Amino acid sequence: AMSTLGTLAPAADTELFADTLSCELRLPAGFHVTADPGSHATAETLLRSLGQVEDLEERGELPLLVQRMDAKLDLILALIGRLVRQSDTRLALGTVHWSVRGIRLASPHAHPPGTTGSVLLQPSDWLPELLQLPADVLASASDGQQHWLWLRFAPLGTGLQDALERHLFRLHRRQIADA
Amino acid sequence: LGTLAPAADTELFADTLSCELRLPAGFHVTADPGSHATAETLLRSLGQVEDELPLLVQRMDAKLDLILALIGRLVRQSDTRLALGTVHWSVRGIRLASPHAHPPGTTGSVLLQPSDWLPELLQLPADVLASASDGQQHWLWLRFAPLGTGLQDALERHLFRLHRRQIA
Amino acid sequence: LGTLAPAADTELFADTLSCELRLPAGFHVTADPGSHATAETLLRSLGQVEDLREERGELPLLVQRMDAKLDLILALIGRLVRQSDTRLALGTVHWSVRGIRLASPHAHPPGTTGSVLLQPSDWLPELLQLPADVLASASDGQQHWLWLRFAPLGTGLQDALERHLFRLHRRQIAD
Amino acid sequence: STLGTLAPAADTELFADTLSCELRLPAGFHVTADPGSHATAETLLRSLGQVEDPLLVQRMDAKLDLILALIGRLVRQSDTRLALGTVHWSVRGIRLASPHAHPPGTTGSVLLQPSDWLPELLQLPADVLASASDGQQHWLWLRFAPLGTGLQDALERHLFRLHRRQIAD
């Protein structure tokens, strides 16, 4: 906590993180000008489904035919995840500051404020799926060895916003948890 | 406008719901058509996922969503893709733009993507009624071969639902 | 088009349901294929989804919707598999629970072992693989014909194949 | 198997007083700082064990079988296969052949394909205990890092069934 990167874009850092849960973490992240995010519902579905399956009984209240079905789903899911890792290009690992409003992350190339595009993020880790969020560049600055971008997400809509808030809240208690 | 083959235009759309929309679609010549079951399953399934029980079932559903999402993306990122474009679609046939003209009577299959998030294509065997060009290019008038009870009921529901969505 | 191998045609098709149909099939000379379990799972599952094509509402609405998602996933994965698989040559074949007679691009001596490769359903890009040996290879006007005798199937697979063949027959008489 | 005499201390640490299965399967050790995931490993093992065993529902189950089979095929297209060799496996660690030898203390991940009909791999973080050669190949004695209650139980169940199955005829 207490990273000075915010001194590079005071007004932007305040817009994105003031008075709202903001998490500083490392995960595959990136920004691309030529969007192709998809829908709010896809992002929302990814986040919610991800929550229902994660964060660390069948013989009872349930038969056994359904346990097998659930087993098969776990297997299919793992295999489809394996398939994806085979072709998709992974995002680079980076330290980012993420809130419901936007994100501060490092980028190979600077981009003037006003540039529009999509923030790419791999939320999970065991699942090679990306969360894409349309966003605009609020600020762009360097610290000497990396170009930093402050991106503000375009309106997320009621459902996705909720899923994202829950997502951030969970990540936060867990980071504090394993401490 | 449409009246560059009024003969077919009337056969395909007169007195029946005919929607005008933009969706990837195309005509592919072949003697190897698809199946009615497959097309019916595709249509009804898209519709049943329009908009609970023990926790294990709720998480099974979450797992399904994740699988569908991942598999859907893989297809969409590696496919040929059909030509986006304005088409006129009814339970009887479709009015779409094709790269080249075709002699009427030419047998083949109309391939269209009924939904855009899901990259699964709908395959319907059809014959060309007319092939007049003018919109700088060649427009085709395709007549679906008899769909059969089930698939026809599915297609009408699809178009009706699709129309209200649009008319709102 | 069967006298080319009298005894072999009698061993594989005498006093037993034998169907004549066209589908992608081939014989692959391989050391060891295997897995009756995979072959049986395929045939039994196909049959259930084949019949799908008991009660409309019935169970919870959520369930019906999950089933739909399954139909979508299967279709999508099917499409993906076709984007890079190798289609097998379509051909007429005589198929019994004991063996199969098909057209091969080349001939093989009696005793050659491998797997009979078949695509059971046109809508599903999945292949059925059954270990088999060649007990007859002869030629007629042109094409090379092989008589493959399946290696023992085991209780389950046999039942699955017999069921599959019977339904195939029944549907065939439906013309 | 006399491979143990090549590294008595390690062989004893990994297989003494515990079920140890000698079998053939694709398995490898790769130097990496990939912490893997206990939850992923446990899910794989329990699910595997589950399948190693109203009409609408039965149809759904049929669809799952078909999907699983196809997805399996896809992965097997462009996936880097593991080396199939004889191994010695216990809940504590595993002895397997390796391309290069490694100094004891070297940490990485053991990769192996639990079932032969599915291309899904199990990853388990481990450290090299011993590393010796029999004149033909380099053998490694890897000690899995703590598995955690759940994963450990799943693995114990997995090895026990495996041992049972193989004691037939």
Residue numbers in the entry:
A (entry chain C): 0 to 55, 62 to 184
B (entry chain B): 4 to 54, 66 to 182
C (entry chain A): 4 to 56, 62 to 183
D (entry chain D): 2 to 54, 68 to 183
The study reports:
Interestingly, after solving the XCC6012 crystal structure, we found that it adopts a novel quaternary PilZ variant that contains an intact PilZ-like domain, yet is interrupted in the middle by two long helices (α2 and α3). Four such XCC6012 molecules are intertwined into a stable tetramer via the heptad repeat α3 helices that form a parallel four-stranded coiled-coil. The quaternary structure of XCC6012 is found to adopt a novel “house-like” architecture, with a central pillar domain comprising the four vertical α3 helices, a roof-top domain comprising the eight inclined α2 and α4 helices, and four corner-stone domains comprising the PilZ domain. In contrast, the clipping treated with the xcc6012 knockout strain (XD62 #2 and XD62 #86) did not cause as much damage as that treated with the wild type strain. This experiment indicates that xcc6012 is indeed a pathogenic gene.
In brief, Se-Met substituted XCC6012 was found to form square-shaped crystals belonging to the space group P21, and contain four monomers and four acetate molecules per asymmetric unit. In addition, XCC6012 contains only a partial c-di-GMP binding signature motif (SxxG) and a long sequence of 57 amino acids comprising two α-helices (α2 and α3) after the β1 strand. Three types of interactions are observed in this unique coiled-coil: Type I consisting of parallel α3 coiled-coil interactions (circled in red in Fig. 2); type II consisting of interconnected helix-helix (α2­α3) and helix-loop interactions (L6-α3, circled in blue Fig. 2), and type III consisting of α2-α4 helical interactions (circled in green in Fig. 2). In the surface of the coiled-coil, a pair of salt bridges between residue Lys77 at position g and residues Asp75 and Asp79 at position e and b, respectively, are observed, which stabilize the coiled-coil as are generally observed in other helix bundles. In addition, several hydrophobic residues are found to locate at positions c (Leu80), e (Leu82, Val89), or g (Leu84) that are normally occupied by hydrophilic residues and exposed to solvent. While wild type XCC6012 exhibited an unfolding temperature of 57.1°C, those of the K77D and D75K variants revealed unfolding temperature at 44.4C° and 53.9C°, which are substantially lower than those of the wild type by 12.7C° and 3.2C°, respectively.
